[PDB]
Amino acid sequence: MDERDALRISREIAGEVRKAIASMPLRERVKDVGMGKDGTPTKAADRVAEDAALEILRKERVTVVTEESGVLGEGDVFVALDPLDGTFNATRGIPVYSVSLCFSYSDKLKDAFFGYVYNLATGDEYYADSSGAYRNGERIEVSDAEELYCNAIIYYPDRKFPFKRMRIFGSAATELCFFADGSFDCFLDIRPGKMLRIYDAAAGVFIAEKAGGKVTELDGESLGNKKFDMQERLNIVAANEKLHPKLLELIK
Amino acid sequence: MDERDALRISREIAGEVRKAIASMPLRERVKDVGMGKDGTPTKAADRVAEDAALEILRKERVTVVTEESGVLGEGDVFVALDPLDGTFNATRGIPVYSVSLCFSYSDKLKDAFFGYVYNLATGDEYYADSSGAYRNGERIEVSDAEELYCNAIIYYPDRKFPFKRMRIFGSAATELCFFADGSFDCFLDIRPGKMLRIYDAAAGVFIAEKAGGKVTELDGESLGNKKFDMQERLNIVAANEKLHPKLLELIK
Ligand SMILES: O=P(O)(OC[C@H](O)CO)OC[C@@H](O)CO
Ligand SMILES: O=P(O)(OC[C@H](O)CO)OC[C@@H](O)CO
Ligand SMILES: O=P(O)(OC[C@H](O)CO)OC[C@@H](O)CO
Ligand SMILES: O=P(O)(OC[C@H](O)CO)OC[C@@H](O)CO
Ligand SMILES: [Mg+2]
Ligand SMILES: [Mg+2]
Ligand SMILES: [Mg+2]
Ligand SMILES: [Mg+2]
Ligand SMILES: [Mg+2]
Ligand SMILES: [Mg+2]
DSSP, X not given: OOHHHHHHHHHHHHHHHHHHHHTSOHHHHTOEEEEOTTSSEEEHHHHHHHHHHHHHHTTSSEEEEETTTEEEEOOSEEEEEEEEESHHHHHTTOSOOEEEEEEESSSBGGGEEEEXXXXXXXXXXXXXXXXXXXXXXXXXXXXXXXXXXXXXXXXXXXXXXXXXXXXXXXOHHHHHHHHHTTSSSEEEEOOTTOOBOHHHHHHHHHHHHHTTOEEEOTTSOOSTTXXXXXXXXXXXXXXXXXXXXXXHHHHO | OOHXXXXXXXXXXXXXXXXXXXXXXXXXXXXXXXXXXXXXXXXXXXXXXXXXXXXXXXXXXXXXXXXTTEEEEOOSEEEEEEEEETHHHHHTTOSOOXXXXXXESSSBGGGEEEEEEEETTTOOEXXXXXXXXXXXXXXXXXXXXXXXXXXXXXXXXXXXXXXXXXXXXXXXHHHHHHHHTTSSSEEEEOOTTOOXXXXXXXXHHHHHHTTTOEEEOTTSOOSTTOBSSTTOEEOEEEEOTTHHHHHHHHTO
């Protein structure tokens, strides 16, 4: 498979998922319908999203690792799929939620070759391949902020910080893209419990890196060895080259 | 002037402001074009919104209290106007920003008779009059959550809190309505510097009160005496009757 295919497949999937979610009233969306292989509940919105996505994906030589249904398939290409990220927002009609896809030649993020995050409420399309990072077809790049006094997306603040702004939107996949296009200066998930899962962050990280960002684990450790499995968890410190180590110092 | 008038005026304003912002490219929206009477910079997006609003508003026998142009007019009905709340989200194409109007028979919040908050990105219309609180025409009400382990919007968290989720969206006017329709369980702005301004919160508070919420200042004291002037500042603690005092203890 190549990044050209990944784009088509992803775009095809975005269409069906967007269509499914939009046609579903909020009353329905918010209903708990099952237990997810990930160990959290599967809302109805999660379900109709995943089933739409899977039906397109199965047809490929991939191993899908997805939030509600767990690990599916045998293919040598691994696909980290959050069928619906920001599920909570979508149940309340809050317009920040996305489908997220990260394609990789192995079960490790270091071998990622395509990232896709598509805002299902606005139609904003983020992706990245070897040619760079895009938002609705246009090249993007992170910001050049040098001072800690910046615009931060941070899960979760637990003390007094020096940021200009803090925001928490509820879709890590989308929020990493907000950082990738430079809307925010950094993205931090520093929650002690290590909460982010591979399908939440993979596409977002890849897109953010191609956009020029430095994206690491909690102590600067590279993320290259993170696995496309259900047990994997992540902290993330993401910011441009200059700003990044200043942040690593700050949360120490 | 009556609550039916304010509805019409508000809708007329919403339309013209929605139009002005939509036709403005992000590159233009984000330019600083002046200093607001509020003491924070007026973005181009703020300016085009306010000019659109004032155009309609100053045809009325009102005193307008607005973010960029300050106190205008001389009528006996006071109008707290945030021509554009969530201005930062608007300059990044992040879909959580609104126009906010509160109409009052005196210069005090206790004499409010109409509240209006229109999400300029989604077209979701929140308002409230004597007949209750509405979202796109449908009645709304707050959540019956009883435990501190709930869904919170909190500016800004600075310690370990017991909430289920925390979110910060960047539009206090809109987020007050998220609480009012029960999307979230509580809204807290407990920033020690007292950052919120009259036009940021007035409409939101009214709508939330008309929807069953208890909405107070930091210590539980009534907000009824808060003034429609530029000098006024607020902390907010909003939750349903049960949850509310539990929150009051928590933040001491
Ligand atoms: O069921 P909800 O939508 O909460 C969603 C999360 O449990 C989903 O993982 O409603 C609010 C409370 O969390 C429920 O008691
Ligand atoms: O536990 P959270 O505070 O909130 C969870 C809800 O957003 C579930 O949809 O953070 C986790 C998010 O799911 C990460 O994208
Ligand atoms: O859009 P900004 O200019 O972004 C901050 C940095 O890029 C400036 O150095 O900040 C917004 C205004 O300060 C709000 O009043
Ligand atoms: O973190 P902030 O300083 O706080 C904003 C509050 O006044 C709520 O509307 O964000 C500032 C931006 O100017 C916003 O558009
Ligand atoms: Mg998800
Ligand atoms: Mg997720
Ligand atoms: Mg989920
Ligand atoms: Mg404003
Ligand atoms: Mg404001
Ligand atoms: Mg402003």
